[PDB]
From a paper:
Here we report a structure-guided approach to engineer monomeric Fc molecules to adapt multiple versions of half-life extension modifications. The pH-dependent Fc–FcRn interaction is a key contributor to the prolonged serum half-life of antibodies and their derivatives. Past efforts to engineer a monomeric Fc, defined as one set of CH2 and CH3 domains, have proved challenging due to the extensive interactions to be disrupted in the CH3–CH3 dimer interface. Monomeric Fc molecules would provide a quick and robust method for achieving structural insight at the Fc–FcRn interface.
Author numbering:
A (entry chain H): 237 to 445
B (entry chain B): 1 to 99
C (entry chain A): 4 to 267
Write the structure that this text describes.
């Protein structure tokens, strides 16, 4: 039986108007007996025809893969409209539907907290700058780091998880050279959220010290 | 976002054979602004074709009127050919006098 | 009542030999103004070419729209996000009863609203990072915001009220539509009834279908401009082939005292 997965747009794409937020409908386990996959897309139960399908790519496990990408209006996604991908194929009785959406609920602004390396952690190759983001709803959020403006490569960020008050929390750690932190470079945790003014949240920058 | 053109082809006055008139090709609801529009008589493109200003509607989508002075017959056919980044092939819409 | 709206468009990469920036100006549904960055001059369109108009009017329009041309093109510099850009503005006014005008100032990047101008405060606002960027670039300029305040709160309400005096006529224009109601075969046992309205103004028009006097509905509509400022509409309803003569088309229009019933 062929499997359908439906992915939401990257949060950053939905918070910047000059980026393309796209939903992504994916079919695996399509038999060579009969490909011929056919997509149907609905925004709030209404069909649209702007979707683009790539050609089916063969996988090394001798099945097929087929992806269909629909661009969404920034404000449709934020107003919480539903995106329904419906896949047709002669390896199923009837088609299968999957629906994806932004979550409904009163949006809450992130509370941001930055932390420098503790002094008792400073004869090591590199040092971590910690970033704690919580009190936000919904869970769509973008988190990156920058020094004196310029973006940064080395950072890991936890998935948003629900807290005991119905808001979401996560953490991000930037690893940096002990020298770059000692040379008094300025580091910032850049957070983007729906409920933030211009979608850009205020955080306090870190600099030793 | 990108939006595919809607294409309407209609005459300025009711189509009476032998009588001077205006053929219009209306292209609306499209984005971005770059678009190509040719009016076709018996399959070949017409030369003396004017057009209105690239303008846009409340939803920000662009629109444009192409038109030519002409005298329709009983056997002559007219169409409108449109290319736009959202179309992988030129789209022909043939003039129907009914509308 | 009636409105004066500038429709402005700048693209960061225009096609070869096409304006990077152009504007159409509208009094209700009629274009009175055309401007583009190639020509550099604001020009009247249609009957507004005949307007009993003051001698400097069209250089006030050129002056104001050159400022905006330069601003719109400055906006792209504030972005530096590689991929190409379209910036649109909907700017103007409509009169509110008792010597008052209600203003409009919206902006779209790549075809979506992202920014506005607040006439109460004198700032560019929006919910979007790219709104902050352009807003901020437009605020570090030679009196950009004061020019925008002036353009909307003084100039638009005057221009509008002066067109009501001098161009009253172009807008009270009433041309009722020429009508056709025709039948074509579609799928076997079925016909397309098509009701056509030709060269009418103003553009507000209601077409619907009757069957032996009874409401048969509005059909599927459609609507478009002509090259001469008139409009065009068709509505189609599928009927039983052999039932066609039981149907007639009712148009309603500002141009007609009483609704007009069209036979096949
Ligand atoms: C033949 O080969 C095929 C190709 O697979 C290959 O993968 C590559 C990467 C390599 O590893 C090689 O091994 C292969 O060549 C096989 O296809 C795969 O089949 C499996 C099983 O069906 C699919 O597994 C699912 O994966 C999703 C997450 O996938 C994302 O992340 C992957 C990287 O980690 C990546 O491979 C995927 O492509 C996909 O990437 C995303 O892509 C989009 C755009 O295209 C991006 O925008 C995203 O950013 C990107 N994401 C990331 C991250 O990178 C996973 O969600 C599925 O789990 C669901 O179902 C489980 C059971 O129900 C459950 O455990 C999960 O919780 C989840 O279920 C949902 O969970 C939420 C909880 O929050 C609930 O709310 C939902 O209700 C619930 N729903 C359901 C129904 O329960 C699952 O693990 C895999 O995606 C697919 N790979 C590709 C590629 O298409 C094929 O199976 C194989 N056959 C055989 C017999 O070998």
């Amino acid at each position: 039986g062929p499997s359908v997965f439906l992915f939401p747009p990257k949060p950053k794409d939905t918070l910047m108007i000059s980026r393309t937020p796209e939903v992504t409908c994916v079919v695996v386990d399509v038999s060579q007996e009969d490909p011929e996959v056919q997509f149907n897309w609905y925004v709030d139960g209404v069909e649209v025809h702007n979707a683009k399908t790539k050609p089916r790519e063969e996988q090394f496990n001798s099945t097929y893969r087929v992806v269909s990408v629909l661009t969404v209006l920034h404000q449709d996604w934020l107003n919480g409209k539903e995106y329904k991908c419906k896949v047709s194929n002669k390896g199923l009785p009837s088609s299968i539907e999957k629906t994806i959406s932004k979550a409904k609920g009163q949006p809450r602004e992130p509370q941001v907290y930055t932390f420098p390396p503790e002094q008792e952690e400073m004869t090591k190759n590199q040092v971590s700058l910690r970033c704690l983001v919580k009190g936000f709803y919904p869970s769509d959020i973008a988190v990156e780091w920058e020094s004196n403006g310029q973006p940064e490569n080395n950072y890991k960020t936890t998935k948003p998880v629900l807290d005991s008050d119905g808001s979401f929390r996560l953490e991000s750690r930037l690893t940096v050279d002990k020298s770059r932190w000692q040379e008094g470079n300025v580091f910032s945790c850049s957070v983007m959220h729906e409920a933030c003014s211009y979608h850009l949240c205020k955080s306090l920058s870190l600099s030793l010290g | 976002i990108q939006r595919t053109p809607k294409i309407q082809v209609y005459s300025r006055h009711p189509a009476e054979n032998g009588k001077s008139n205006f053929l219009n090709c209306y292209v609306s609801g499209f984005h971005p602004s770059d678009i190509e529009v040719d009016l076709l008589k018996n399959g070949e493109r017409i030369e003396k074709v004017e057009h209105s200003d690239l303008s846009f509607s409340k939803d920000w989508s662009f629109y444009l009127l192409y038109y030519t002075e002409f005298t329709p017959t009983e056997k002559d056919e007219y169409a409108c050919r449109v290319n736009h980044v959202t179309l992988s092939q030129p789209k022909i819409v043939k003039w129907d006098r009914d509308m | 009542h009636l409105s004066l709206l500038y429709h402005l468009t700048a693209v960061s990469s225009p096609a070869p030999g096409t304006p990077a920036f152009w504007v159409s100006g509208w009094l209700g549904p009629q274009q009175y103004l055309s401007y583009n960055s190639l020509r550099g001059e604001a020009e009247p369109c249609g009957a507004w070419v005949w307007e009993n108009q003051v001698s400097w009017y069209w250089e006030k329009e050129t002056t104001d729209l050159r400022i905006k041309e330069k601003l719109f093109l400055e906006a792209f510099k504030a972005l530096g996000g590689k991929g190409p850009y379209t910036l649109q503005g909907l700017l103007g006014c409509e009169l509110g009863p008792d010597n008052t005008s209600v203003p409009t100032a919206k902006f779209a990047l790549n075809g979506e609203e992202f920014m506005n101008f607040d006439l109460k405060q004198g700032t560019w606002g929006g919910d979007w990072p790219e709104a902050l960027a352009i807003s901020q670039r437009w605020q570090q300029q030679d009196k950009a915001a004061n020019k925008e305040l002036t353009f909307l709160l003084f100039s638009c309400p005057h221009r509008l009220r002066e067109h009501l005096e001098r161009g009253r006529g172009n807008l009270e224009w009433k041309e009722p539509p020429s009508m056709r109601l025709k039948a074509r075969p579609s799928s076997p046992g079925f016909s397309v009834l098509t009701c056509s309205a030709f060269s009418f103004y103003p553009p507000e028009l209601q077409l619907r279908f009757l069957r032996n006097g009874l409401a048969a509905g509005t059909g599927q509509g459609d609507f478009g401009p002509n090259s001469d400022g008139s409009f065009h509409a068709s509505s189609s309803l599928t009927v039983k082939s052999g039932d066609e003569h039981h149907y007639c088309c009712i148009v309603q229009h500002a141009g007609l005292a009483q609704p007009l019933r069209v036979e096949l």
